């Protein structure tokens, strides 16, 4: 009942959760942009940063600086969300490696939609269809890998999918422990290790 649970990710929603460690780590990942105005003193980090300069900076910073008329900067999509990689996902979602390409693939992609890109519709449909394609294999592997090494199953899953995988594993193990009668015993908590 009263176990520890972190703040849940809100990255698929309209805005991410303020206190979510997953959302913070997701928003740290870098996004390509172009500066639409010059920025004095900023050449110390990248003298001024000149106008029209290409940069890759964190998503949190890009969301802070961005506006719908692109005064400070304008945003480019990462290549995995552009039309080339969308087609690879459309081919077969089950063979791609969203741990390499993420590890927060869906959360980062959902947060890109707030930059008013012309291909927001294509991005949204791509994310939804990637999830639909990968659902059955996530379900089967999570609910039927029992008491074995799950690293091969978990390797190519993004963090959202890995969360779902652990949920399925929890259900499987709970029912199996009940069936074997191990759910009856009263046990010392996980803090008993020290």
């Amino acid at each position: 009942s009263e176990a520890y649970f972190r703040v849940e990710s809100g990255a698929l929603g309209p805005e991410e959760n303020f206190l979510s460690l997953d959302d913070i780590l997701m928003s740290h990942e870098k996004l390509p942009v172009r500066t639409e105005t010059a920025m004095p003193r900023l050449g110390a980090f990248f003298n001024a940063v000149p106008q029209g300069s290409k940069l890759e900076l964190p998503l949190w910073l890009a969301k802070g600086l961005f506006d719908n008329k692109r005064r400070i900067l304008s945003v480019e999509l990462p290549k995995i969300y552009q039309e080339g990689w969308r087609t690879v996902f459309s081919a077969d979602p089950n063979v791609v490696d969203l741990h390499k390409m993420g590890p927060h693939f869906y959360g980062f992609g959902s947060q890109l939609l707030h930059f008013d890109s012309p291909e927001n519709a294509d991005i949204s449909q791509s994310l939804l269809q990637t999830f639909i394609g990968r659902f059955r294999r996530i379900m089967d592997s999570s609910q039927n890998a029992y008491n074995e090494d799950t690293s091969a199953l978990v390797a190519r899953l993004d963090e959202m999918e890995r969360g779902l995988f652990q949920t399925g594993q929890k259900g499987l193990n709970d029912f199996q422990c009940w069936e074997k009668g191990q759910a009856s015993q009263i046990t010392a908590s996980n803090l008993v290790q020290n």
Partner: protein, 176 residues
Amino acid sequence: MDAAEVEFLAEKELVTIIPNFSLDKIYLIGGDLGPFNPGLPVEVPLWLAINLKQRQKCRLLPPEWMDVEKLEKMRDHERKEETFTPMPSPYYMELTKLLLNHASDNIPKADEIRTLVKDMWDTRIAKLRVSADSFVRQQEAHAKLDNLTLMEINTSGTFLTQALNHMYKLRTNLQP
């Protein structure tokens, strides 16, 4: 909800025992029981029945549905139908485990009963898997699961509900 909690609710179901002790009617908060007369049947909740069996104070009788022919008919009907069929108890799996683990001596043909209940469980879990896959593939927003039992739902429902929450947000992310 844990499988142990599902078992806790299954433990409220009524079963018939044959006491070897004499005791007048007892007025429990959840409803009175007894009187307990030696050698005669009396109907009591499953937790009490299992406790008395463990303390050697009664003989448990199988429920009316724990019969091999009836269970074979129900199993074949389940295997033939596409939808979940009505089950002989809303906690049939939990009932089977408790009664057969604690009272196999009292219940004849317990091996056949356990295997048939296992067959029904496998068929219905396969049907539930098909339902989940169809929901996600066809992008449903609602499903009808009339004859599923609580343990059967609880085995897969947390995973399924989390997946559907993510799917809903993914298909509504363009709303503003």
